[PDB]
Amino acid sequence: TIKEMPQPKTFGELKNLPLLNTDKPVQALMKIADELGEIFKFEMPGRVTRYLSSQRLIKEACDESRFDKNLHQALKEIRDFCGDGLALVWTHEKNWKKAHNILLPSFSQQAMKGYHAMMVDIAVQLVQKWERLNADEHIEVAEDMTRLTLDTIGLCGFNYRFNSFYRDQPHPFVISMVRALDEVMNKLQRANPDDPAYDENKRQFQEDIKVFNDLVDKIIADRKARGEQSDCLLTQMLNGKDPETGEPLDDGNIRDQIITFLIAGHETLSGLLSFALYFLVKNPHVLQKVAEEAARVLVDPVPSYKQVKQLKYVDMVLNEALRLWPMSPAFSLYAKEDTVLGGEYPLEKGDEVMVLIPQLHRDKTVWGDDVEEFRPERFENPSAIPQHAFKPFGNGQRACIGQQFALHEATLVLGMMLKHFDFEDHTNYELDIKEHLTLKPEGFVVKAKSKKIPLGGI
Amino acid sequence: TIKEMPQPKTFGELKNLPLLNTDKPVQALMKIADELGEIFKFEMPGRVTRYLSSQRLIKEACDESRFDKNLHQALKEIRDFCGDGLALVWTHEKNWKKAHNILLPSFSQQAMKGYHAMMVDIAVQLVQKWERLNADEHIEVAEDMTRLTLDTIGLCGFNYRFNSFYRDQPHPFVISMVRALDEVMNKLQRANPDDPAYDENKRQFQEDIKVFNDLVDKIIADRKARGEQSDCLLTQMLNGKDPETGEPLDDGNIRDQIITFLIAGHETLSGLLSFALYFLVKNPHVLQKVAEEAARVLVDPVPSYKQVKQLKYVDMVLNEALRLWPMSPAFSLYAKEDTVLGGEYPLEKGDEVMVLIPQLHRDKTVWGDDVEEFRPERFENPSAIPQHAFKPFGNGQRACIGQQFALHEATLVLGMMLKHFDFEDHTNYELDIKEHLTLKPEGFVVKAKSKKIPLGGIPSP
Numbered sequence: 001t002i003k004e005m006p007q008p009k010t011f012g013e014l015k016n017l018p019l020l021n022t023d024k025p026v027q028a029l030m031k032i033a034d035e036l037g038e039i040f041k042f043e044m045p046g047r048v049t050r051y052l053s054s055q056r057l058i059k060e061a062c063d064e065s066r067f068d069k070n071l072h073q074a075l076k077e078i079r080d081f082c083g084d085g086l087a088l089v090w091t092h093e094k095n096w097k098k099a100h101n102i103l104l105p106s107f108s109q110q111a112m113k114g115y116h117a118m119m120v121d122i123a124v125q126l127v128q129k130w131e132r133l134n135a136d137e138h139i140e141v142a143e144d145m146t147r148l149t150l151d152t153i154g155l156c157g158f159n160y161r162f163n164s165f166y167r168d169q170p171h172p173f174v175i176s177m178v179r180a181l182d183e184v185m186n187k188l189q190r191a192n193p194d195d196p197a198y199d200e201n202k203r204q205f206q207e208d209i210k211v212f213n214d215l216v217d218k219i220i221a222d223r224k225a226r227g228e229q230s231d232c233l234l235t236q237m238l239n240g241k242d243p244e245t246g247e248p249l250d251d252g253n254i255r256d257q258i259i260t261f262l263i264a265g266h267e268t269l270s271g272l273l274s275f276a277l278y279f280l281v282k283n284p285h286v287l288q289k290v291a292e293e294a295a296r297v298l299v300d301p302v303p304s305y306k307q308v309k310q311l312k313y314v315d316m317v318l319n320e321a322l323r324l325w326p327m328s329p330a331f332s333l334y335a336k337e338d339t340v341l342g343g344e345y346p347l348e349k350g351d352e353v354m355v356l357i358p359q360l361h362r363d364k365t366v367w368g369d370d371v372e373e374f375r376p377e378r379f380e381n382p383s384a385i386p387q388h389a390f391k392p393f394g395n396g397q398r399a400c401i402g403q404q405f406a407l408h409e410a411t412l413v414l415g416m417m418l419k420h421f422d423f424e425d426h427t428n429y430e431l432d433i434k435e436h437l438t439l440k441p442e443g444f445v446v447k448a449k450s451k452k453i454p455l456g457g458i
Numbered sequence: 459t460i461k462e463m464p465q466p467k468t469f470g471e472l473k474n475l476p477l478l479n480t481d482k483p484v485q486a487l488m489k490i491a492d493e494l495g496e497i498f499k500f501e502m503p504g505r506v507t508r509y510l511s512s513q514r515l516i517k518e519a520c521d522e523s524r525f526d527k528n529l530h531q532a533l534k535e536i537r538d539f540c541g542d543g544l545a546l547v548w549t550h551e552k553n554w555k556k557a558h559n560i561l562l563p564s565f566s567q568q569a570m571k572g573y574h575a576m577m578v579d580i581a582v583q584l585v586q587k588w589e590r591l592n593a594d595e596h597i598e599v600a601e602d603m604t605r606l607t608l609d610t611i612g613l614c615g616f617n618y619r620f621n622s623f624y625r626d627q628p629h630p631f632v633i634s635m636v637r638a639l640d641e642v643m644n645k646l647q648r649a650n651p652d653d654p655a656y657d658e659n660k661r662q663f664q665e666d667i668k669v670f671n672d673l674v675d676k677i678i679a680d681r682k683a684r685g686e687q688s689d690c691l692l693t694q695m696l697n698g699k700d701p702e703t704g705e706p707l708d709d710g711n712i713r714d715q716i717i718t719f720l721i722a723g724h725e726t727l728s729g730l731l732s733f734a735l736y737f738l739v740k741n742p743h744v745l746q747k748v749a750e751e752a753a754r755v756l757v758d759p760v761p762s763y764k765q766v767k768q769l770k771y772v773d774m775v776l777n778e779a780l781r782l783w784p785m786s787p788a789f790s791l792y793a794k795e796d797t798v799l800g801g802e803y804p805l806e807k808g809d810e811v812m813v814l815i816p817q818l819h820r821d822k823t824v825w826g827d828d829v830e831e832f833r834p835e836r837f838e839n840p841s842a843i844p845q846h847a848f849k850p851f852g853n854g855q856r857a858c859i860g861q862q863f864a865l866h867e868a869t870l871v872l873g874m875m876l877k878h879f880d881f882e883d884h885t886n887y888e889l890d891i892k893e894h895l896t897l898k899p900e901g902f903v904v905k906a907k908s909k910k911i912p913l914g915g916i917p918s919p
């Protein structure tokens with residue numbers, strides 16, 4: 001038969017694998033999408049998927065009656081150290097429904113008002129650290145952003161202080177996480193994954209796993225020393241039952257959820273803050289306008305929940321940064337039944353289809369011709385944006401459970417940053433997106449001149 | 459009645475050296491003083507000195523008309539990396555008078571009121587660090603005190619942020635300083651100092667010196683980026699003239715003073731704070747009384763200058779810690795002319811005599827029979843203390859120029875510590891005084907339970 005979809009160059013038994021022989025496979029796939037079109041087939045030894053890049057097809061892919069969430073190989077390999085976490089379970093397994101019903105109350109607006117204080121604590125830590133630098137000292141943006149987001153997720157969801165700011169080096173948990181992610185990404189490119197030559201790598205992987213487990217233990221132990229304090233994730237994990245089955249999460253599942261949320265609740269958020277600061281220093285008029293909104297809204301020494309909710313331009317800037325470079329850049333789906341996507345591409349039952357979020361966010365037929373320009377004003381009227389054209393947090397019931405958490409924290413931190421400092425791109429930094437499955441700017445450095453605004457104690 | 463001076467066992471060409479083959483030489487000399495008496499002679503290859511331990515002889519040694527400050531071998535070896543600092547120059551030389559007249563205004567009571575804000579800044583940093591610990595986490599006392607004192611001396615005297623709290627490891631300057639000081643202390647005890655086996659050590663020494671110089675440069679550079687701000691010691695060093703000779707300090711002398719003050723204004727102070735906290739956790743009733751006085755006086759979120767000056771019991775505790783274990787434990791003097799010490803020991807022109815401060819502070823004929831007891835109340839009436847019986851900061855013109863600085867900083871920090879926390883000796887720590895020329899407790903760890911008292915803000919301009 002005649003195929004209906006384009007497909008890039010195959011290399012024999014290696015299929016399309018040699019096309020991802022880079023450190024930036026997501027950007028390589030973005031280039032392939034630029035070449036072939038909205039949808040194209042991609043074959044690797046043992047698996048076949050179809051990459052979607054246009055709103056026309058993705059709005060049908062998000063129809064939960066026709067497609068459901070699939071665990072692409074990256075997630076299946078993350079399961080080795082995250083277990084059956086909330087993000088690594090099929091939508092139809094008991095683990096997902098149980099954990100979802102148990103953990104969803106932890107992200108209500110009341111829990112947001114609760115986490116606000118600790119978020120402000122870590123934000124104050126970051127601002128003070130930047131204030132206490134000497135002259136002619138720069139800021140390693142990604143590093144301090146990871147410090148802040150890790151401390152925040154820890155303190156807010158587990159009442160545990162990582163104290164990343166009291167370390168001149170990255171936290172060991174962060175380093176082990178990055179090593180594990182790099183190992184997963186490399187394992188995805190191995191023709192013969194059971195080759196003995198990879199044994200060394202595998203061994204190192206286990207060491208990283210050890211680190212993770214150790215941290216979990218301490219967190220659990222620390223709880224037993226303090227007790228139930230905030231209505232955090234840990235309280236609901238330990239003392240929480242399913243309103244349907246009446247069962248609480250077992251101990252192994254609790255450990256899995258702990259590692260999963262620790263990893264998820266800080267890496268992508270770090271990427272978001274770094275990208276936002278990059279675009280702000282690269283568009284001076286937007287920088288000035290957001291600084292004006294920050295100085296206008298944030299009037300108290302410490303910002304309040306309502307003040308963060310009134311930072312509309314900060315939210316628009318964050319959403320535009322999410323648009324241009326979604327930190328979690330893709331998600332996979334499978335067809336529940338045979339269907340015809342877009343009325344032009346037939347799909348069988350169980351076929352794999354992956355959404356290339358940056359190319360969806362660059363669909364000119366929906367966004368315009370200025371897709372590559374950082375213009376947050378395009379989020380002025382939220383209803384003017386067509387359906388399913390902006391999907392940085394997933395879709396449907398399997399969407400990011402901490403979307404409100406992440407947006408609130410990032411808004412607060414960026415507001416305080418632009419209130420208390422004025423930033424300078426002292427190097428003319430050329431963007432370089434490093435990939436550990438997720439995207440993050442590497443080498444981004446700026447200088448900050450304090451606006452000398454007092455930061456009191458509350 | 460001319461007596462013959464005692465002397466411990468001699469070992470041939472090594473003289474009394476084999477008695478000091480320890481890492482705690484000051485404590486060994488204290489034991490020798492307990493055995494032999496008020497005065498005893500001590501010979502090392504190439505040098506001879508006489509150790510004094512009684513108020514009767516030390517009050518004559520502090521007679522500036524008969525004796526002047528001598529640079530003992532420890533200071534001559536410190537000069538290798540501190541240069542001709544204020545503490546390392548003879549009293550009669552032009553360098554000391556010039557540098558003294560230039561730098562003395564930096565320690566007036568007005569300059570203290572100025573430094574108070576930055577002191578409170580670093581103190582808030584320390585308290586915040588301790589509040590943010592998890593349960594079942596102990597406190598490395600000496601490490602955090604060194605953090606605080608280094609950050610404070612930097613911020614106050616050079617407007618430079620070391621940010622010792624943003625490092626889980628000791629600052630590299632502190633590590634190089636401790637290694638150089640241990641090298642001086644060990645070099646003073648080496649039978650064969652030119653033996654090839656020690657060559658490596660010497661090499662390491664030089665590397666440390668590099669570090670020092672590098673830091674100095676940064677400080678200078680940082681000033682040129684900011685300008686004359688807090689009118690610190692650096693302002694007086696660079697833009698300061700002698701009210702007598704009209705000369706400003708040259709550049710090499712400025713670097714020497716920078717390194718000298720950076721080391722002096724924090725090492726001994728770290729030791730003082732560590733010792734005081736030790737004595738407080740080992741005498742719970744004194745701890746409670748000082749905590750109560752702290753809660754009475756410090757009522758604002760951040761303490762003020764007057765509030766620090768109203769903490770008399772904290773000052774008495776600091777002074778008792780200074781008495782029992784003076785962080786700088788000795789100083790040397792030489793006889794201007796031939797004289798008769800105590801009416802019993804003849805001294806020639808230029809003979810060396812060193813004051814053993816801990817034994818002076820343990821002279822029962824002046825302090826009582828409880829010299830070994832931690833009783834700060836003995837500093838209630840300051841006029842009740844006899845003359846020349848308490849010399850933790852030196853004597854005469856060559857006394858500690860930053861004594862007010864050290865006492866104010868230590869009082870403020872200890873007051874805030876005892877206001878915001880309750881301490882627990884969770885290990886029943888057995889005292890161990892580590893010596894790198896200075897004295898400081900090593901291995902001291904405690905736990906802190908917060909009283910959950912709020913802390914205020916600071917502008918940080």
Ligand code: HEM
Nearest residue numbers: 087264265268269272328331393394398399400401402406
């Ligand atoms: C800018 C920041 C973030 C971005 C772009 C992002 C993106 C995403 C995406 C695309 C998914 C869906 C993956 C899929 O369907 O295969 C997802 C799910 C998820 N996110 Fe995030 N996320 C962010 C921050 C966070 C934070 C702060 C948390 C904190 C708890 C979090 C926790 C989760 C979890 C647990 C899931 C899986 C939930 C489920 O499937 O039931 N994420 N996120």
Ligand code: HEM
Nearest residue numbers: 545722723726727730786789850851852856857858860864
């Ligand atoms: C508990 C803390 C301290 C103790 C026990 C202490 C002890 C001493 C002693 C015993 C001397 C006399 C040395 C001798 O006569 O050979 C001295 C001198 C000196 N100290 Fe301190 N000190 C302390 C803190 C400080 C501080 C905070 C500074 C800040 C600058 C400082 C700087 C100096 C200087 C420059 C001299 C030499 C002054 C001169 O000779 O004109 N010290 N100190």
